[model samples]
Target: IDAKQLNSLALAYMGDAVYEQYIRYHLLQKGKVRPNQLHRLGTSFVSAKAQAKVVYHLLETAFLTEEEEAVLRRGRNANSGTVPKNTDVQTYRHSTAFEALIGYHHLLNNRERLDEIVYKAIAVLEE
Candidate 1:
């Protein structure tokens, strides 16, 4: 990957694609599917709102490592600029934290572990 200064937003941009790629890959494995269909359906699974829910459910889990917890804390406390105009403060906070986690995972290059965590988060929240 090319190197440049990546702030939270840069991280989030890559994180967004990373999250979407995860969703699409997992969903593909669960069934036989097409790319375009996956793109349309996967949005429901990988939206900022869905991520907020995932982050909230992660709070109930007991497996976070110290570094993982630190990443989450930093993400939660990061000054991520203004909340999206259409979203409330709580949503914005949770969404930013979720994106931060994604970015952190990407930077760490722990794709398998990240996938596991995301799946666990989604499964818990969906229940």
Candidate 2:
């Protein structure tokens, strides 16, 4: 599978789904929340602002290795060409990049790393 050949936006598409599922799955494992409440909680982690925060947190903490950083940069640099009023363009891009990084790992079949980042992302949002 030529994951490298996929466009960054395309990567983000898959990453978005994968990461959302991770959040939802995690919320479900807790087992006492209302359905709507779970959705709200999941949104807290998946929102653009929250995701961009994770990117910044990762940067400051040096959680990413050189190769991972390269993927993060590539994803952020992808021009998706629209801005949602709720967030600045930079935040949108960083979230897109975050998704793309998840996609990158998924495509690479790097389950361990993918799990690591997703869990770390949830912790970031919790704080």
Candidate 3:
């Protein structure tokens, strides 16, 4: 499928699940398992605000390609429904945009590129 033609929201839907799996996998790689602790750790990385920060960081750091940036813009401008409490509208939309970029790369089966972006996102979070 040409991910470019898919609706941004739909891209974001798939990206959300893909990103969550990546996070879970990363957490498990720590070689320990504690469900309660995992949830607490996950909250910091998985929130919309966190994602928005990652996207913004990527933009400033020149991490995205031209096509990827276009995809991000498309997702950012897309009309997704209501914003959740504690998250501003701009951040929410940018979060969706980040998800859309991930989904687009996932749909393309570009594992190397996906890993690069994922690593960058983690670095952003760590900063």
C-alpha TM-scores of all predictions: 0.73, 0.93, 0.92
Q: 6-118, model 2: which lDDT tens digit per residue?
A: 88888888899999888888889977988878877887899998999999998889999988888888898647677777778899888889999999899999999999999
In model 3, which runs have C-alpha deviations exceeding 4 angstroms? Answer: none
lDDT (Cα, tens digit) per residue for candidate 1, span 26-112: 787887776678766776677667777777777766567776665666665555566667777776666666776777688768888
Error of 2 at 90 (Å): 0.8
- Best-to-worst order by lDDT is 2, 3, 1
Q: Per-residue CA lDDT of candidate 3, range 1-127, in tens?
A: 8887999998998898899999888888874877779987876777888999999898998888899999999998646576777778898899899999999999999999999998888877977
| Local error of candidate 3 at residue 107 (angstroms) | 0.3
| TM-score, candidate number 1 | 0.73
What TM-score number comes out for model 3?
Answer: 0.92
TM-score, cand. 2 vs. native:
0.93
Sort all candidates by TM-score, best to worst: 2, 3, 1
Residue clash pairs of candidate 2: none
- Cα lDDT of candidate 1 equals 0.69
Clash number by candidate, in order:
0, 0, 0
